[PDB]
Amino acid sequence: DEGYPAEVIEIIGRTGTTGDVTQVKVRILEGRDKGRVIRRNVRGPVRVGDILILRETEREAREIK
Amino acid sequence: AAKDKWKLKQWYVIYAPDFFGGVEVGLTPADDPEKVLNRVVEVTLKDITGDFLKGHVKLYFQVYDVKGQNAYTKFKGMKLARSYIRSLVRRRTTRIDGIFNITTKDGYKLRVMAMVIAARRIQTSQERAIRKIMQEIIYKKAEELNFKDFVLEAVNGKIAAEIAKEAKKIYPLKKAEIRKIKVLGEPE
Amino acid sequence: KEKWGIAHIYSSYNNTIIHITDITGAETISRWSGGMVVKADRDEPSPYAAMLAARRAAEEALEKGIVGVHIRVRAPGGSKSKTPGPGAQAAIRALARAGLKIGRVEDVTPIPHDGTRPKGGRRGRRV
Amino acid sequence: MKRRPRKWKKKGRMRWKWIKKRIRRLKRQRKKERGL
RNA sequence: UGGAGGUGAUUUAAAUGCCAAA
RNA sequence: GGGACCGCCAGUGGCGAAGGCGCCCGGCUGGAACGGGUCCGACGGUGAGGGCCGAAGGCCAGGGGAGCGAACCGGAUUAGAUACCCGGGUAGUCCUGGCUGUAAAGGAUGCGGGCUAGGUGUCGGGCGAGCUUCGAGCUCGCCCGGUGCCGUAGGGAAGCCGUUAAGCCCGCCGCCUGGGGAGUACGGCCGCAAGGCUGAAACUUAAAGGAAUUGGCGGGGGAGCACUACAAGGGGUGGAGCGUGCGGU
Ligand SMILES: [Mg+2]
Ligand SMILES: [Mg+2]
Ligand SMILES: [Mg+2]
Ligand SMILES: [Mg+2]
Ligand SMILES: [Mg+2]
Ligand SMILES: [Mg+2]
Ligand SMILES: [Mg+2]
Ligand SMILES: [Mg+2]
Ligand SMILES: [Mg+2]
Ligand SMILES: [Mg+2]
Ligand SMILES: [Mg+2]
Ligand SMILES: [Mg+2]
Numbered sequence: 008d009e010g011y012p013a014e015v016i017e018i019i020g021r022t023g024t025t026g027d028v029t030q031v032k033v034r035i036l037e038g039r040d041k042g043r044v045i046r047r048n049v050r051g052p053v054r055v056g057d058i059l060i061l062r063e064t065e066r067e068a069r070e071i072k
Numbered sequence: 073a074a075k076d077k078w079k080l081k082q083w084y085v086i087y088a089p090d091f092f093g094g095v096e097v098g099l100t101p102a103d104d105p106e107k108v109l110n111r112v113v114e115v116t117l118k119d120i121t122g123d124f125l126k127g128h129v130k131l132y133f134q135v136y137d138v139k140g141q142n143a144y145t146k147f148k149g150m151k152l153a154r155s156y157i158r159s160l161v162r163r164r165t166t167r168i169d170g171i172f173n174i175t176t177k178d179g180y181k182l183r184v185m186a187m188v189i190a191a192r193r194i195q196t197s198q199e200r201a202i203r204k205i206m207q208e209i210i211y212k213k214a215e216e217l218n219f220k221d222f223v224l225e226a227v228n229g230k231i232a233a234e235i236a237k238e239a240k241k242i243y244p245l246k247k248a249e250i251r252k253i254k255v256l257g258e259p260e
Numbered sequence: 261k262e263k264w265g266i267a268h269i270y271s272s273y274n275n276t277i278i279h280i281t282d283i284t285g286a287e288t289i290s291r292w293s294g295g296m297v298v299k300a301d302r303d304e305p306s307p308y309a310a311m312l313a314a315r316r317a318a319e320e321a322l323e324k325g326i327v328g329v330h331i332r333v334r335a336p337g338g339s340k341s342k343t344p345g346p347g348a349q350a351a352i353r354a355l356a357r358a359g360l361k362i363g364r365v366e367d368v369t370p371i372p373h374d375g376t377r378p379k380g381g382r383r384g385r386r387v
Numbered sequence: 388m389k390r391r392p393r394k395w396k397k398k399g400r401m402r403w404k405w406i407k408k409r410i411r412r413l414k415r416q417r418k419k420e421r422g423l
Numbered sequence: 424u425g426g427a428g429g430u431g432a433u434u435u436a437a438a439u440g441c442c443a444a445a
Numbered sequence: 446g447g448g449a450c451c452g453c454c455a456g457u458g459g460c461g462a463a464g465g466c467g468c469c470c471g472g473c474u475g476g477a478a479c480g481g482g483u484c485c486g487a488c489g490g491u492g493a494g495g496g497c498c499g500a501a502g503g504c505c506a507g508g509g510g511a512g513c514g515a516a517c518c519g520g521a522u523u524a525g526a527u528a529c530c531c532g533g534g535u536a537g538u539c540c541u542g543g544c545u546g547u548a549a550a551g552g553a554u555g556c557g558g559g560c561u562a563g564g565u566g567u568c569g570g571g572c573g574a575g576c577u578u579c580g581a582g583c584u585c586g587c588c589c590g591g592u593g594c595c596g597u598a599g600g601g602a603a604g605c606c607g608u609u610a611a612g613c614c615c616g617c618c619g620c621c622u623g624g625g626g627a628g629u630a631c632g633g634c635c636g637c638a639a640g641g642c643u644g645a646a647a648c649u650u651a652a653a654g655g656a657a658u659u660g661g662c663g664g665g666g667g668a669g670c671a672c673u674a675c676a677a678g679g680g681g682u683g684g685a686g687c688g689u690g691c692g693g694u
Contacts, residue, residue, distance in 0.1 A: 024676085025676040026675095026676070027677075065354075065357065066308070066311075078324070081287075086283075098284075099261065099263055099283070100282050100284050100286070100287065101287050112284065113283060113284050154367075155366065158453085161453060162454080163454075163455080163456080164454095164456085165454070166454070167453080167454050170469080189454095191582095193454090193456080193458095194581090195581085197581080200470095201581075203469080203470090239580095240578080240580060241582095242581060243580070243581075243582070244578085244580070339513095371452075371453095372450085372451095372452065373450085373468085374450050375452085376449070376512045377449085377450090377512055378513080379514095380513095381513085385529095387433090387434090388628055388641095389628050389642095390628095391627090391628075392549080393653095395549080396654095410629080411640090414629090
């Protein structure tokens with residue numbers, strides 16, 4: 008109902024139709040799967056050290072080249 | 073109303089056949105005990121006797137009689153895991169197969185599939201010779217042994233070892249297996 | 261003791277079916293398909309629909325006393341495609357996350373030894 | 388018919404297969420009128 | 424370095440060429 | 446219960462005159478390579494007329510019919526859609542006895558003989574040497590016959606071919622003579638039919654055809670770039686009245 012914070016640890020690359028989406032690796036900070044590292048797609052400027060609020064932590068983005 | 077129908081089911085315990093030890097292998101639900109007949113369960117040889125080598129051998133047991141809450145089974149067939157035999161067949165080798173219909177000493181009808189993998193490509197006449205050797209060994213074993221002893225030797229690997237030792241004289245081998253067994257009939 | 265069942269997973273390019281039965285396969289515990297959790301025909305084979313269906317099936321199985329399952333996953337096979345769709349792996353992962361133990365995993369796609377003739381003529385679909 | 392593989396080339400003409408079909412259709416009609 | 428084969432696939436719709444050059 | 450088909454191993458690997466031939470065991474049968482101080486003694490090459498074999502499809506009788514699927518019946522797409530896509534579906538595809546004799550049936554290269562640098566893979570047989578778990582096993586070298594690649598002299602318009610010749614020489618048969626009309630008309634033979642083989646003229650035309658070069662283009666591939674491109678944004682024009690320029694009247 009409030010989501011789970013995750014911390015960005017690595018930048019992979021740009022993607023999307025018009026280069027608007029970035030793929031990152033994040034580490035869960037709270038919840039059932041705290042400590043796991045998964046990759047995600049993010050819209051907007053982002054840098055290492057930012058914190059995202061995920062609404063669910065079971066979907067993983069498909070790897071890009 | 074549906075969960076009402078689920079409450080009418082009772083659980084029955086399934087046992088392995090007599091010559092495998094007769095150990096418990098699982099449980100199954102049913103409302104009428106007559107409906108449990110002819111059900112089939114598949115278990116690996118590692119579960120019967122614990123050893124991490126024979127985890128790719130699969131045995132099928134079929135329920136034939138129910139008494140109380142217990143179900144007793146018979147041997148029906150054996151097979152090797154598909155992913156296992158799929159990793160044996162490679163290019164620049166030769167695969168030799170033989171399928172035989174046999175009758176054991178005590179009047180059991182069986183169909184047996186054996187397989188041999190050669191180290192390299194070989195000529196077809198050598199394949200025929202190896203297949204003939206396999207046939208002779210299997211016929212002799214079937215004539216000599218009873219049903220239970222034959223099944224135990226086939227699943228343990230004695231027959232394959234004898235086949236490999238005899239067939240080394242035609243060409244060096246890499247593997248030799250009894251690939252599949254199915255029972256067809258039983259004595260009257 | 262331990263009640264173990266079997267999870268049959270049917271995965272194609274158009275849908276996904278998850279079917280939990282008992283150890284012998286003759287009694288059905290639960291059954292859920294992609295068309296029972298989504299509204300758009302386009303979303304039936306998506307991984308997310310597979311996750312939802314797997315969660316529903318796992319909950320229904322857990323409430324009835326099942327502890328773990330062995331997995332059998334198949335593509336349509338036969339004269340159709342031999343490759344499972346995108347929802348198989350998502351279905352497998354969701355079952356474990358819901359609380360069920362996982363036994364052995366194998367694929368049981370039916371493969372012909374030169375069987376029958378497929379559709380499309382000798383030129384195939386021309387799109 | 389006799390073979391003229393030069394006719395199969397597609398530059399500046401229609402397909403030879405259908406020309407052959409059209410000629411065969413035309414020859415049927417003459418044959419029918421001849422039998423009358 | 425350069426070649427020859429085989430098996431898979433390949434996300435809606437989208438026709439035409441006037442005036443002029445003379 | 447039923448009808449069709451034999452996956453991986455499988456290999457510019459094998460066999461056959463070509464068309465073609467792939468589950469296993471048994472019977473009958475054709476051809477070729479290698480080894481040969483065996484036998485006969487020029488018995489040979491090509492082959493007009495003539496004969497036999499010949500993918501798929503089609504036809505004539507009798508069976509069979511799972512899957513697929515001309516014609517056809519419906520659902521869509523579209524300006525229309527007699528189509529491409531989707532759901533069904535008759536003949537046919539399969540077996541027994543005949544007929545038809547056609548393919549980009551292509552190695553687009555007729556067959557026999559002698560000769561003209563090398564290098565390197567692979568299949569069958571034989572010989573020599575060395576290993577070996579003693580295996581109808583393994584490795585290396587040479588001879589003969591098949592099957593691929595790179596290449597010297599020579600050949601060719603070039604692409605390329607090059608002891609598996611499209612090179613130099615000794616033979617025999619078949620075919621061609623600018624593009625269309627036309628593989629048509631008329632006549633003849635063959636076939637149940639569908640069709641097969643043979644095959645002109647009047648007239649018309651300045652090119653048709655081949656190999657390679659430079660560009661331009663592609664609802665082909667790869668790399669890069671732009672607020673007169675997009676994506677994230679800020680402000681607008683298109684509706685009203687008026688200023689000014691253009692078409693028309
Ligand atoms: Mg649906
Ligand atoms: Mg159709
Ligand atoms: Mg289209
Ligand atoms: Mg020509
Ligand atoms: Mg002759
Ligand atoms: Mg051919
Ligand atoms: Mg050679
Ligand atoms: Mg060369
Ligand atoms: Mg005539
Ligand atoms: Mg612009
Ligand atoms: Mg924009
Ligand atoms: Mg305005």
